[PDB]
Amino acid sequence: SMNPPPPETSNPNKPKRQTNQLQYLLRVVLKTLWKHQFAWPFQQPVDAVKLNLPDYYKIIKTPMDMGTIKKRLENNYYWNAQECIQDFNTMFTNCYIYNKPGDDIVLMAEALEKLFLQKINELPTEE
């Protein structure tokens, strides 16, 4: 029923890159999803105490959220775009696994994921 420590967002010994694909993931992908009217439940780690979800972290072992992704992008945490893309997909998948079809939170994730898929379809060529 307790919250775990958050996912890692800083590690000075992890090698980093600044690339046009990662720039796109922040400037287009993250920004598009973040400003959406369904973003709010996804803008920070799931607070299982606040939301009375005592079994959430019993079930979900790789938590992920856009707050974490935002910090990772803004802090240059990643080596490549696929790392970041995986974080988004983990976020959506966690939601789908924990909840039931047609749940409000699932419909919200589905709408964000539709936008996500469109932007990723348009992922720029590597410079």
Ligand X SMILES: Cc1cc(Nc2ccccc2C)n2cnnc2n1
Tokens 């775009």, residue located:
81
Q: Which residues contact 51 (CB under 8 A, 6 or more apart)?
A: none
Selected binder of ligand X within 19, 76, 98, 111 (CB under 6 A): 98
Amino acid of residue 70: K
Selected binder of ligand X within 99, 110, 115, 120 (CB under 6 A): 99
What residues numbered 28-47 form the site for ligand X, per CB under 6 A? 40-42, 46-47
- 76 φψ region: left (φ > 0), alpha (ψ -120 to 50), beta (else): left
Whether residue 113 contacts residue 96, with contact meaning beta carbons closer than 8 Å, is answered with: no
**Binding-residue pattern over the window 100 to 119 for ligand X, x denoting contact by CB under 6 A:** -----x--------------
Query: Measured from the CB atom, is 59 or 117 closer to ligand X?
Result: 59
Which residues of the chain form contacts with ligand X (CB under 6 A)?
A: 40-42, 46-47, 51, 53, 95, 98-99, 105
